[PDB]
Amino acid sequence: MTLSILVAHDLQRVIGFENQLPWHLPNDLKHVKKLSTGHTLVMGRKTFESIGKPLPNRRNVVLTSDTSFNVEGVDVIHSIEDIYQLPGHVFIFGGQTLFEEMIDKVDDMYITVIEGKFRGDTFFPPYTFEDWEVASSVEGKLDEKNTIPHTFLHLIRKKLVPR
């Protein structure tokens, strides 16, 4: 069951400020929608509270220690271990804590690199391309509504081989 990270981060790996995306970029929300519709998003509780409602047309799974959590349209899990039981293509959708927890465990990552420097208070963990093969790299198209340069990366973990 393919396990992927799904994230947008800026040139300094910022992913959030005051529990919201620091950028306004409609084409990347379209990207997220295209990739995850019909599949599963796993997210930590703050990320979920940030969006406020489940994203439509896909399974929303929320990781929390709160056994009181029960939101309509949302499935709850209480540990990381539960992620590996989830059927199908599972995307780790945030936030900083969950990415830190999962970056060493996922098969691959769909990263939108936001090609600017924003003020942030939450970050994606450092990673090196030494470890990740660029399966694809696609420059986002800019327009009136989408004015920050950005790049769609699909990265796949490199195998460790002798020599």
Sign of CA dihedral 133, 135, 137, 140: negative
Q: How far is the CB of 52 from ligand NAP (least distance, A)?
A: 12
The answer to whether 28 is a known ligand-binding residue is: yes
Per rule CB under 6 A, is residue 40 in the interface with ligand NAP? no
- Residue 32 main-chain phi, psi, to 5 deg: -55, -50
Confirm or deny that 64 is annotated as ligand binding: yes
Question: What whole-number distance in Å separates Cα of residue 149 and Cα of residue 64?
Answer: 34
Binding mask 64-103 for ligand NAP (x = CB under 6 A): xxx-----------xxx------------xxxxxx--x--
Q: What is the 3-state secondary structure (H, E, C) of 53-81?
A: CCCCCCEEEEECCCCCCCCCCEEEECCHH
Separation CA 98–CA 81 (nearest Å): 12
104 marked ligand binding residue? no
- Verify binding: residue 154, ligand NAP, rule CB under 6 A: no
Q: Which residue is nearest to ligand NAP (CB)?
A: 95
From residue 9, give the alpha-carbon distance in Å to each of 64, 70, 119: 23, 30, 12
Region from 58-66, 102-110, 144-152, 155-163 binding ligand NAP, contact rule CB under 6 A = 58-66
Decide whether 46 or 157 has the Cβ nearer to ligand NAP.
46
Q: Which residues bind ligand NAP (CB under 6 A)?
A: 7-9, 15-16, 19-21, 43-47, 50, 63-66, 78-80, 93-98, 101, 122
